[PDB]
Structure formats: C-alpha cells, structure tokens
C-alpha cells in the first residue's frame, strides 16, 4: 500500500506543557475552555465568559488551524520522502542513496515538527492569557470561605459516565498484541536481512518499523494519559467530599477536573487516529513482505 496520511506527527514546546496536534482543536487546552463554559453556566455570578468563549477562544481555535495550515508546504515534502523510502518502485527511480534519503527524512521530519511549534508559539502565549482571565473570573465570586462544591462534584458524576463510553479495555489489549507482532517483525527482518540479496525491499520494511515505533509510542502516551484522567477523577469521587471550601481551593478543583477531562477527550481523538495509522502501516509491512521474493 501507500502512506496516504501522516497526521500522527506532533510536537511539544521546550517546557513540555503544550502538545501540538494536527487534528482539531490542536490543543487539549481548547477542550478545557469548552468545559469551563459549562462550569460558568451553573454559576449565576459569572456571565462575562460567554463572550470570551465566543471571541477569544474562537480566535485561538482559528489561529491554531491557520498556524498548522502554514506548515502544509513542509508537510508534503516530509510525506513525499515517506512514500519513497517505503515503496521500492519509487525508490528505484531516484538516483540518491538510501542512507542519504533516510537522513533527509530525519531532517525534514523535524522541520515539519519544528514548523508546527514555531508557527503556534504566538498561540501558546494566547492560551496563558485565557487561563489568567478564568482565574480572574473565579476571583469575582461572592463566596470566600463558603464556596460550594456541588457543581464540582456533580461534574465528576457526569465525567464518569462519559468515561464509560471509551474502549480503554480494547486499546490496551490491542497495543500489547500489536507490539508483540512488532518486535517479532523487527527480529524477523534482521535475521532475513543476512540471508537475502534484496536491499531495497528489506530497507523499506526497516523504515516502516521506524515509523511504526514512533506511532506506538504516541499511542502509548495518549493511552496512558486517558487512563490517568479516568483513574484520578475516579479517585476524586472516592475521596473527601468537602461541603464548603475556600475560593482558592475551588479554583484548583475546577482546574483539576477541567484539565483531567480535556486530556481525556484529547487522547480519545488521537487514539482513534493513531489506531488507524498502526493498522495501515502493518498492512504496508506485509505487502512489502509478500514482495520479498519478486515483483
């Protein structure tokens, strides 16, 4: 087959706080903003946020899709090298070596990942400014030492039902069996490498395994991030149940479940995309394995 889509690449900033994604909304923080509009509706003391989510959040959403779109020219050059290294027919037409072509892939791949971060650096400062507005909006609450946690605990019940609509049990079994076939495919092609005079086809399988290795790690990251949100929120429903907290403790409560649930939905969108990529690249390996003898 052929790698028709390369939406599995991503990039994080130097602080590793913000994770860029090619899929919308490109930020797990935007899902947190979508969830705070739900928090502000239950509070009759916060009414200015409806206009913030309608302008400041939509501007950050569109600027994110725009900043990702600028790297489309760089994305196609990286994708083009992926299709050359994995297809022996396309590689046999070009004149450069495989070591040179593989090093170009590693250089261009980081150029695309570096583009997504650098073009979104202005948006990274925009996310921080919206968080300070939310923290300032919570300060305007009338409660000081008597802030009710009913809205905070009612949201935990809503989240746990939404967590059940997640095939976490199916993803863990899938990734554990996919790796067993992966390392078996690794050890297999190296044993075969020394017994077959077919350098291009073997190298194409090696390169796909390098691509698969990157996607398996991105799959395990989001899969472990979905689990942490499910387990930590569950721990909140089985912990203390304070009737009234301080306004400072209330801000931390909304930012806790708000950040937990946003990472959950952000990982669910990525795990779906990363699942199709793992299946697709596994098909490309077997199509290359069947092409080992001839054609």
């Amino acid at each position: 087959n052929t790698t028709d889509n390369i939406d599995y690449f991503d990039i994080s900033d130097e602080s590793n706080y913000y994770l860029i994604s090619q899929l919308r909304p490109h930020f797990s923080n935007i899902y947190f903003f979508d969830e705070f509009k739900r928090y502000a509706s239950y509070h009759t003391e916060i009414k200015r946020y409806e206009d913030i989510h309608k302008t400041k959040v939509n501007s950050l959403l569109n600027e994110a899709s725009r900043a990702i779109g600028i790297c489309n020219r760089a994305k196609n050059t990286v994708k083009g090298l992926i299709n050359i290294l994995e297809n022996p027919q396309k590689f046999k037409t070009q004149r450069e070596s495989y070591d040179v072509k593989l090093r170009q892939y590693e250089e261009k791949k980081e150029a695309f990942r570096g583009c997504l971060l650098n073009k979104n650096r202005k948006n990274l400062d925009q996310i921080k400014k919206i968080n300070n507005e939310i923290r300032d909006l919570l300060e305007k609450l009338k409660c000081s030492q008597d802030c009710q946690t009913n809205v905070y605990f009612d949201m935990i019940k809503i989240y746990l039902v939404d967590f059940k609509k997640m095939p976490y049990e199916n993803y863990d079994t899938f990734i554990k069996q996919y790796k067993n076939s992966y390392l078996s495919g690794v050890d297999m092609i190296r044993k075969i490498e020394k017994q077959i005079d077919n350098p291009v086809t073997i190298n194409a399988i090696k390169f796909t395994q390098k691509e698969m290795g990157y996607i398996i790690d991105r799959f395990e990251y989001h899969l472990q991030k979905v689990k942490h949100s499910i387990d930590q929120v569950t721990a909140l429903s089985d912990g203390v149940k304070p009737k009234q907290v301080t306004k400072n403790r209330l801000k931390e409560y909304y930012f806790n479940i708000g950040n937990y649930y946003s990472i959950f939905k952000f990982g669910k969108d990525s795990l779906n995309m990363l699942n199709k990529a793992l299946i697709h690249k596994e098909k490309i390996v077997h199509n290359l394995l069947g092409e080992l003898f001839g054609h």
Partner: antibody, heavy 122, light 108 residues
Framework: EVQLLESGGGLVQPGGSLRLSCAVS????????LSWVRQAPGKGLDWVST????????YYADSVKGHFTISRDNSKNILYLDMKSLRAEDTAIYYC???????????????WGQGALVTVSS | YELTQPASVSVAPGQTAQITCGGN??????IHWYQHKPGQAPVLVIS???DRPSGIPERFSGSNSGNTATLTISKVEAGDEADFYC???????????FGGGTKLTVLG
C-alpha cells in the same frame, strides 16, 4: 559524543529509599527510550527497568517490581530511578543506558553510563 | 529464558578469541554482545547476531546458529581485556536477559 551521566548514588540503610538521576548529553532526550541496568559485586549485568521515549509504557523485572520505580522528566530531560525499600541484595552499581530502538524500546542497549554505586548497610 | 556463558576465557595476544553464549533454540533470537571494562561504561560491540556499530573494528565478529552464538575477536590485544556479556530479549514476559558473563584474560 553521546554520554549519560549518573548521580545520586551512595549509602542507604536497609529499608531506606534512594532517588537516582541521569542527565543526557549528545542527543535529544525526548526521542529515545532509556533503561537501568545494575551489576552486583561479583556478579554480572542485571537488567532493572526500561521506559518508552514518552513514558507511555514501562517495563520491570520480577525481582524489582516491588521497590524500583521508573520516572521520566521530558521537560528537564532527566531520567530517574526511585528505590522504595532497599535490601542487602540491592547493593550494586547502576548504569544509566538508553535503548537502541526508535521511541519504543527494541530491547537492546545503544549507549551506557559510567555507573553509580549504591551501598546498603547500617 | 536463560543464557549460559563460560565464566573465563584465556587468549594469547595475537590469537583469535571465541566467546560462546548458549541457550535453547538460540538461532531464532537476536543477540547483542557487550564489552565491559571495570570502572568504565559498557559498550555495544555486536548487535543483532552479526552487525557492528560504527567505531568497532573488523576484528570483532558475530555468528548465531542452532543452540549457541559465538563472539569472535580476530587479532586480540591487551586492550581488549574485559568481561563480555551476551544479551537477548525475552519476548514472553518482555524484559532484557543477560548471560552469566565471560572474563576475557589476555596473557601478557
């Protein structure tokens, strides 16, 4: 060049706890899988635990699952090893080593460190 | 899984060293060899049966067939004196397994 620098090892009492650290120079910390391998006095290399490049998966040894815990910090680019309950069997030199595979561990070691001595005695 | 390694091997300088690593159906697994000088960092000499990373001389060689894999050093020097370890990954429980170790003593 590529090198890994251990630090934190020393004297621990039986039952105490130690936090081992490992710095990196020569490559990007986020893109490679790391692991710990220890060598007891008069014994060979004993594999302890490995971790994925992003922390998605972690692997341990049977004689290790109880106490040792892998920790990663892709921001500060530091690799940790927390030892919960130290016994006399854990006196060894611990080598910070990185996996030669791409992001997910291929389970063969690419580079190694000089080692950090950990002594367990009162 | 268990890998078996002769504890000691003696070589005269200039001869060829052959360190063996054994196990059941070894010819179906990928084996990597490590050199370890005391006080220094171990070095991956041979990986995946026969491959050698950059910076490793052609004197080092690797084979693997049947029940044993052999690490071969063609023109042994006094600087190659170190204990060597073979390494395979146990795909069942998914962790790294090392051999017992083999002290390589060059008779200088």
């Amino acid at each position: 060049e590529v090198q890994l620098l251990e630090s934190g090892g020393g004297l621990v009492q039986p039952g105490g706890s130690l936090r081992l650290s490992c710095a990196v120079s020569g490559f990007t910390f986020r893109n490679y899988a790391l692991s710990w391998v220890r060598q007891a006095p008069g014994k060979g290399l004993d594999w302890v635990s490995t971790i994925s490049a992003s922390g998605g998966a972690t692997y341990y040894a049977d004689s290790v699952k109880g106490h040792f815990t892998i920790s990663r910090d892709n921001s500060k680019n530091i690799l940790y090893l927390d030892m919960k309950s130290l016994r006399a069997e854990d006196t060894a030199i611990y080598y910070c080593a990185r996996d030669g595979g791409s992001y997910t561990p291929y389970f063969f070691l690419d580079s190694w460190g000089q080692g950090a001595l950990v002594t367990v005695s009162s | 899984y268990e890998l078996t390694q002769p504890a000691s091997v003696s070589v005269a300088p200039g001869q060829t060293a052959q360190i063996t690593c054994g196990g059941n159906s070894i010819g179906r697994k990928s084996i990597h060899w490590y050199q370890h000088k005391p006080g220094q960092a171990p070095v991956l000499v041979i990986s995946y049966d026969s491959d050698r990373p950059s910076g490793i001389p052609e004197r080092f060689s690797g084979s693997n067939s049947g029940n044993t894999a052999t690490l071969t050093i063609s023109k042994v020097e006094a600087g190659d004196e170190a204990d060597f370890y073979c390494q395979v990954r146990d795909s069942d429980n998914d962790h790294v397994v090392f051999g017992g170790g083999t002290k390589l003593t060059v008779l200088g």
